[PDB]
Design a protein around this ligand. Structure first.
Ligand SMILES: Nc1nc(=O)c2c([nH]1)NC[C@H](CCc1ccc(C(=O)N[C@@H](CCC(=O)O)C(=O)O)cc1)C2
Length: 159
């Protein structure tokens, strides 16, 4: 089963860690818990963004160029990447944008963290149609000593 997971700002905006103005450790705990022990697909750009494989997960890089690092699995296409995952109950798509887009059509689920924050950014999560997706989980949290901003966890499943 294909899954997508992300953190969005005002208006479906998404960006890198350092590109990000917020600071929510709870969001990372949430991401960790939901990607741990599962394969994770990502584009090159996010790979480079992270800089080290994510521990506890098979890291697969969807990229068009030959990879320059033995610590992860390099894939050249959507089908390649899914096969590299072999038989697992859930595959997680971690981005970025093109990535997100290319898989949403395959996705059956969505883990999203809505962040209460306006920010200027080059990219956006794909415009997905809410009549098509059912919200099965939701949990709002005020900002705290830990978390800079207010955020909301939500999990949708394709009806
Ligand atoms: N919910 C959600 N929030 C996010 O911020 C992102 C997504 N999804 N999906 C895509 C994306 C990828 C960026 C990204 C950057 C760093 C780490 C990272 O260090 N993860 C550690 C967290 C450290 C900790 O959990 O204390 C991990 O082991 O998963 C993960 C993802 C960022």
């Amino acid at each position: 089963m294909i899954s997508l997971i992300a953190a969005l700002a005002v208006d479906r905006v998404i960006g890198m860690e350092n590109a990000m103005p917020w600071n929510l450790p709870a969001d990372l705990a949430w991401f960790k818990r939901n990607t741990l022990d599962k394969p994770v697909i990502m584009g090159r750009h996010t790979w480079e963004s992270i800089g080290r494989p994510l521990p506890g997960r098979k890291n697969i890089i969807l990229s068009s160029q030959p990879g320059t690092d033995d610590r992860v699995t390099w894939v050249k296409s959507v089908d390649e990447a899914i096969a590299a995952c072999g038989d697992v109950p859930e595959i997680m798509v971690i981005g970025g944008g093109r990535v997100y887009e290319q898989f949403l059509p395959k996705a059956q689920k969505l883990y999203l963290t809505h962040i209460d924050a306006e920010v200027e950014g080059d990219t956006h999560f794909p415009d997905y149609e809410p009549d098509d997706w059912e919200s099965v989980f939701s949990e709002f949290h005020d900002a705290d000593a830990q978390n800079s901003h207010s955020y909301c966890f939500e999990i949708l499943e394709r009806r």
